[PDB]
Amino acid sequence: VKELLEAGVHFGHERKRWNPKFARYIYAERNGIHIIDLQKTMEELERTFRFIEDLAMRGGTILFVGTKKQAQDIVRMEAERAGMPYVNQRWLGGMLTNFKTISQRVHRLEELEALFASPEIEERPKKEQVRLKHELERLQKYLSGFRLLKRLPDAIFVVDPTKEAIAVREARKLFIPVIALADTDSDPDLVDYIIPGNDDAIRSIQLILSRAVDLIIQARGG
RNA sequence: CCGCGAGGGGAGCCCUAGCACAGGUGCUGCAUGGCCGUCGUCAGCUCGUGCCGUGAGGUGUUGGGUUAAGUCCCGCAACGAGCG
Protein backbone atom coordinates (compact mmCIF):
# COMPACT_ATOMS: atom_id res chain seq x y z
CA VAL A 1 0.00 0.00 0.00
CA LYS A 2 0.81 3.70 -0.33
CA GLU A 3 -0.69 6.42 1.84
CA LEU A 4 -2.34 9.76 0.99
CA LEU A 5 -1.43 13.24 2.17
CA GLU A 6 -2.80 12.58 5.64
CA ALA A 7 -1.48 15.88 6.89
CA GLY A 8 -4.08 15.79 9.61
CA VAL A 9 -1.21 14.35 11.61
CA HIS A 10 2.62 15.14 11.52
CA PHE A 11 2.92 18.75 10.51
CA GLY A 12 5.67 19.54 13.03
CA HIS A 13 6.83 18.74 16.51
CA GLU A 14 9.61 20.38 18.46
CA ARG A 15 9.98 23.98 19.60
CA LYS A 16 13.45 25.46 19.03
CA ARG A 17 15.59 22.63 20.37
CA TRP A 18 16.20 21.43 16.86
CA ASN A 19 19.37 20.25 15.22
CA PRO A 20 20.84 22.50 12.57
CA LYS A 21 21.64 19.58 10.29
CA PHE A 22 17.86 19.02 10.20
CA ALA A 23 17.45 22.26 8.26
CA ARG A 24 16.85 20.57 4.93
CA TYR A 25 13.78 19.03 6.46
CA ILE A 26 11.74 21.94 7.68
CA TYR A 27 9.19 24.33 6.15
CA ALA A 28 9.06 27.15 8.68
CA GLU A 29 8.39 28.53 12.15
CA ARG A 30 4.81 29.16 13.35
CA ASN A 31 4.13 30.05 16.97
CA GLY A 32 7.71 29.10 17.85
CA ILE A 33 7.56 25.67 16.18
CA HIS A 34 9.38 24.12 13.27
CA ILE A 35 7.01 22.72 10.73
CA ILE A 36 8.19 19.81 8.63
CA ASP A 37 7.99 20.12 4.82
CA LEU A 38 5.68 17.25 3.99
CA GLN A 39 5.95 17.45 0.25
CA LYS A 40 9.49 16.39 1.08
CA THR A 41 8.59 13.76 3.69
CA MET A 42 6.78 12.16 0.83
CA GLU A 43 10.01 12.03 -1.20
CA GLU A 44 11.71 10.34 1.77
CA LEU A 45 8.96 7.86 2.35
CA GLU A 46 8.83 6.87 -1.33
CA ARG A 47 12.41 5.82 -0.68
CA THR A 48 12.14 4.42 2.78
CA PHE A 49 9.16 2.38 1.86
CA ARG A 50 10.94 1.27 -1.31
CA PHE A 51 13.65 -0.15 0.96
CA ILE A 52 11.50 -2.06 3.37
CA GLU A 53 9.53 -3.64 0.48
CA ASP A 54 12.92 -4.85 -0.80
CA LEU A 55 13.61 -6.28 2.65
CA ALA A 56 10.25 -7.86 3.19
CA MET A 57 10.06 -9.79 -0.10
CA ARG A 58 13.75 -10.65 0.21
CA GLY A 59 12.61 -12.31 3.43
CA GLY A 60 14.60 -10.31 5.98
CA THR A 61 13.99 -9.22 9.52
CA ILE A 62 13.54 -5.75 10.99
CA LEU A 63 13.82 -4.99 14.64
CA PHE A 64 11.32 -2.46 15.86
CA VAL A 65 12.46 -0.35 18.71
CA GLY A 66 10.97 2.72 20.32
CA THR A 67 11.30 3.23 24.08
CA LYS A 68 9.37 6.52 24.17
CA LYS A 69 6.37 6.36 26.51
CA GLN A 70 3.86 7.24 23.77
CA ALA A 71 4.98 4.77 21.06
CA GLN A 72 5.37 2.09 23.79
CA ASP A 73 2.08 0.27 23.22
CA ILE A 74 2.23 0.88 19.46
CA VAL A 75 5.62 -0.65 19.01
CA ARG A 76 4.34 -3.86 20.61
CA MET A 77 1.25 -3.81 18.37
CA GLU A 78 2.90 -3.20 15.02
CA ALA A 79 5.73 -5.67 15.44
CA GLU A 80 3.23 -8.20 16.72
CA ARG A 81 1.03 -7.49 13.67
CA ALA A 82 4.10 -7.99 11.52
CA GLY A 83 6.35 -10.96 11.49
CA MET A 84 8.76 -8.97 13.63
CA PRO A 85 10.97 -8.58 16.78
CA TYR A 86 10.53 -5.49 18.91
CA VAL A 87 11.86 -3.71 21.95
CA ASN A 88 9.08 -2.27 23.92
CA GLN A 89 9.95 -1.94 27.57
CA ARG A 90 13.60 -0.86 27.65
CA TRP A 91 16.61 -1.08 25.39
CA LEU A 92 19.52 -3.05 26.88
CA GLY A 93 23.04 -1.92 26.22
CA GLY A 94 24.21 -4.30 23.51
CA MET A 95 21.37 -6.10 21.93
CA LEU A 96 23.67 -6.05 19.02
CA THR A 97 27.25 -5.35 20.03
CA ASN A 98 26.73 -7.87 22.78
CA PHE A 99 23.98 -10.06 21.23
CA LYS A 100 25.61 -13.40 21.88
CA THR A 101 25.98 -12.46 25.61
CA ILE A 102 22.38 -11.36 25.65
CA SER A 103 20.93 -14.20 23.68
CA GLN A 104 22.05 -16.28 26.72
CA ARG A 105 19.39 -14.52 28.75
CA VAL A 106 16.81 -15.54 26.20
CA HIS A 107 17.83 -19.17 26.92
CA ARG A 108 17.29 -18.45 30.55
CA LEU A 109 13.70 -17.53 29.75
CA GLU A 110 13.49 -20.61 27.58
CA GLU A 111 14.81 -22.74 30.46
CA LEU A 112 12.60 -21.25 33.14
CA GLU A 113 9.47 -21.40 31.05
CA ALA A 114 10.02 -25.17 31.18
CA LEU A 115 10.20 -25.58 34.93
CA PHE A 116 6.90 -23.68 35.36
CA ALA A 117 5.21 -26.50 33.48
CA SER A 118 7.16 -29.56 34.64
CA PRO A 119 6.58 -31.57 37.86
CA GLU A 120 9.74 -30.18 39.43
CA ILE A 121 7.95 -27.06 40.58
CA GLU A 122 6.78 -27.01 44.20
CA GLU A 123 8.90 -30.11 44.62
CA ARG A 124 11.97 -28.13 45.72
CA PRO A 125 12.23 -25.04 48.05
CA LYS A 126 9.73 -22.25 48.03
CA LYS A 127 12.32 -19.53 48.61
CA GLU A 128 13.79 -20.37 45.22
CA GLN A 129 10.28 -20.59 43.75
CA VAL A 130 9.62 -16.92 44.10
CA ARG A 131 13.32 -16.33 43.43
CA LEU A 132 12.63 -17.85 40.04
CA LYS A 133 9.08 -16.71 39.50
CA HIS A 134 10.59 -13.22 39.65
CA GLU A 135 13.25 -13.98 37.07
CA LEU A 136 10.59 -14.96 34.56
CA GLU A 137 8.54 -11.88 35.28
CA ARG A 138 11.43 -9.54 34.49
CA LEU A 139 12.53 -11.48 31.42
CA GLN A 140 9.00 -11.53 30.04
CA LYS A 141 9.22 -7.78 30.13
CA TYR A 142 12.36 -6.84 28.36
CA LEU A 143 12.85 -9.80 26.05
CA SER A 144 9.10 -10.23 25.26
CA GLY A 145 9.85 -9.31 21.68
CA PHE A 146 13.55 -9.73 21.60
CA ARG A 147 12.85 -13.49 21.69
CA LEU A 148 12.19 -13.76 17.96
CA LEU A 149 15.82 -12.83 17.20
CA LYS A 150 17.51 -15.90 15.80
CA ARG A 151 20.49 -13.83 14.65
CA LEU A 152 21.26 -10.14 13.99
CA PRO A 153 18.44 -8.18 12.24
CA ASP A 154 18.72 -6.95 8.68
CA ALA A 155 17.42 -3.53 9.83
CA ILE A 156 16.39 -1.38 12.67
CA PHE A 157 13.27 0.56 12.56
CA VAL A 158 13.73 3.14 15.24
CA VAL A 159 11.05 5.51 16.46
CA ASP A 160 12.75 8.47 18.24
CA PRO A 161 16.40 8.15 17.06
CA THR A 162 17.89 10.81 19.20
CA LYS A 163 16.48 8.98 22.25
CA GLU A 164 17.69 5.59 21.13
CA ALA A 165 21.06 6.89 19.84
CA ILE A 166 22.51 3.91 21.64
CA ALA A 167 20.54 1.43 19.62
CA VAL A 168 21.45 3.55 16.65
CA ARG A 169 25.15 3.71 17.68
CA GLU A 170 25.11 -0.09 17.81
CA ALA A 171 23.49 -0.68 14.43
CA ARG A 172 25.72 2.00 12.99
CA LYS A 173 28.82 -0.05 14.03
CA LEU A 174 27.54 -3.46 12.85
CA PHE A 175 26.59 -2.12 9.48
CA ILE A 176 22.87 -2.74 9.99
CA PRO A 177 20.45 -0.41 8.23
CA VAL A 178 18.68 2.26 10.26
CA ILE A 179 15.14 3.46 9.63
CA ALA A 180 13.54 6.09 11.75
CA LEU A 181 10.52 8.20 12.28
CA ALA A 182 12.66 11.21 13.02
CA ASP A 183 11.90 14.88 13.46
CA THR A 184 13.34 18.28 14.22
CA ASP A 185 15.44 17.01 17.17
CA SER A 186 17.27 14.26 15.23
CA ASP A 187 20.59 14.25 13.34
CA PRO A 188 19.63 12.78 9.91
CA ASP A 189 23.28 12.27 9.28
CA LEU A 190 22.94 8.86 10.84
CA VAL A 191 19.72 7.43 9.69
CA ASP A 192 20.09 5.16 6.68
CA TYR A 193 16.43 5.73 5.82
CA ILE A 194 14.69 8.63 7.59
CA ILE A 195 11.10 9.68 7.75
CA PRO A 196 10.76 13.35 8.88
CA GLY A 197 7.84 13.37 11.24
CA ASN A 198 6.09 14.34 14.44
CA ASP A 199 6.39 11.47 16.85
CA ASP A 200 5.18 12.16 20.42
CA ALA A 201 1.73 12.28 18.78
CA ILE A 202 0.21 8.84 19.02
CA ARG A 203 -1.55 9.68 15.77
CA SER A 204 1.94 10.04 14.12
CA ILE A 205 3.65 6.88 15.29
CA GLN A 206 0.36 5.08 14.88
CA LEU A 207 0.16 6.01 11.22
CA ILE A 208 3.84 5.71 10.27
CA LEU A 209 4.02 2.17 11.56
CA SER A 210 0.69 1.09 10.31
CA ARG A 211 1.42 1.82 6.68
CA ALA A 212 4.94 0.55 7.30
CA VAL A 213 3.78 -2.81 8.65
CA ASP A 214 0.93 -2.93 6.18
CA LEU A 215 3.58 -2.49 3.48
CA ILE A 216 5.70 -5.27 5.03
CA ILE A 217 2.78 -7.65 4.83
CA GLN A 218 1.53 -6.94 1.26
CA ALA A 219 5.18 -7.39 0.38
CA ARG A 220 5.37 -10.92 1.66
CA GLY A 221 1.98 -11.72 0.13
CA GLY A 222 -0.65 -12.31 2.78
C1' C B 1 69.58 -76.84 54.37
C1' C B 2 73.92 -81.09 53.83
C1' G B 3 75.96 -86.91 52.46
C1' C B 4 74.51 -91.30 58.44
C1' G B 5 78.20 -88.93 62.71
C1' A B 6 81.26 -85.80 64.41
C1' G B 7 80.28 -81.44 62.43
C1' G B 8 79.79 -77.54 58.11
C1' G B 9 77.37 -73.19 55.84
C1' G B 10 72.81 -70.27 56.67
C1' A B 11 67.85 -67.13 58.54
C1' G B 12 66.23 -64.51 62.84
C1' C B 13 68.30 -62.94 67.68
C1' C B 14 73.02 -61.36 70.89
C1' C B 15 78.26 -58.97 71.94
C1' U B 16 82.77 -57.21 70.37
C1' A B 17 86.20 -54.07 67.18
C1' G B 18 85.88 -50.73 62.88
C1' C B 19 82.20 -48.22 59.17
C1' A B 20 77.48 -45.90 56.58
C1' C B 21 74.23 -43.82 59.85
C1' A B 22 71.16 -43.16 63.98
C1' G B 23 70.09 -38.39 67.73
C1' G B 24 69.93 -32.90 68.65
C1' U B 25 63.16 -28.92 72.13
C1' G B 26 70.87 -26.32 68.47
C1' C B 27 69.72 -21.06 64.92
C1' U B 28 66.60 -19.39 61.31
C1' G B 29 58.53 -18.55 61.49
C1' C B 30 61.99 -12.59 56.74
C1' A B 31 63.87 -19.54 53.69
C1' U B 32 58.72 -22.72 54.12
C1' G B 33 53.99 -26.45 54.60
C1' G B 34 50.30 -27.05 57.61
C1' C B 35 47.21 -24.84 61.24
C1' C B 36 45.73 -20.32 63.86
C1' G B 37 45.06 -14.74 65.60
C1' U B 38 43.42 -10.49 63.18
C1' C B 39 40.52 -6.26 60.24
C1' G B 40 35.86 -9.03 60.25
C1' U B 41 30.17 -12.47 60.30
C1' C B 42 32.37 -6.49 58.39
C1' A B 43 29.87 -6.57 52.98
C1' G B 44 32.39 -6.48 50.52
C1' C B 45 36.43 -8.65 46.56
C1' U B 46 36.31 -9.48 41.38
C1' C B 47 35.65 -11.72 36.12
C1' G B 48 33.68 -12.57 31.05
C1' U B 49 31.67 -10.19 27.07
C1' G B 50 29.76 -5.28 25.57
C1' C B 51 30.77 0.05 25.76
C1' C B 52 34.08 4.75 27.45
C1' G B 53 39.08 6.30 27.40
C1' U B 54 45.59 7.60 23.31
C1' G B 55 46.40 5.30 28.37
C1' A B 56 46.78 4.15 33.45
C1' G B 57 41.85 3.08 34.12
C1' G B 58 36.26 3.32 33.78
C1' U B 59 31.52 1.23 33.59
C1' G B 60 28.88 -3.24 35.77
C1' U B 61 29.52 -3.03 42.02
C1' U B 62 26.72 3.37 40.73
C1' G B 63 22.47 6.75 41.99
C1' G B 64 17.08 7.22 44.40
C1' G B 65 14.09 3.58 47.56
C1' U B 66 14.92 -0.78 51.03
C1' U B 67 17.68 -4.58 54.12
C1' A B 68 20.63 -7.43 59.27
C1' A B 69 23.49 -7.84 54.13
C1' G B 70 26.58 -5.96 46.83
C1' U B 71 19.02 -8.10 50.68
C1' C B 72 15.69 -6.90 47.21
C1' C B 73 12.91 -2.62 44.11
C1' C B 74 13.33 1.63 40.32
C1' G B 75 16.43 3.55 37.44
C1' C B 76 21.35 3.41 34.15
C1' A B 77 25.79 1.17 28.60
C1' A B 78 25.36 -2.76 30.12
C1' C B 79 24.22 -8.18 30.48
C1' G B 80 25.64 -11.89 33.13
C1' A B 81 29.04 -14.87 36.29
C1' G B 82 32.57 -16.19 40.51
C1' C B 83 34.34 -15.92 45.81
C1' G B 84 30.83 -13.65 49.91
UniProtKB/Swiss-Prot annotation:
One of its GO terms (biological process) is translation. InterPro entries: Ribosomal_uS2, Ribosomal_uS2_bac/mit/plastid, Ribosomal_uS2_CS, Ribosomal_uS2_flav_dom_sf. GO terms for molecular function: rRNA binding; structural constituent of ribosome. GO terms for cellular component: cytosolic small ribosomal subunit. It holds the Pfam family Ribosomal_S2. Residues 98-143 form a coiled coil. Part of the 30S ribosomal subunit. Contacts protein S8 and may contact the N-terminus of Era. Spans the head-body hinge region of the 30S subunit. Is loosely associated with the 30S subunit. Belongs to the universal ribosomal protein uS2 family. This is Small ribosomal subunit protein uS2.
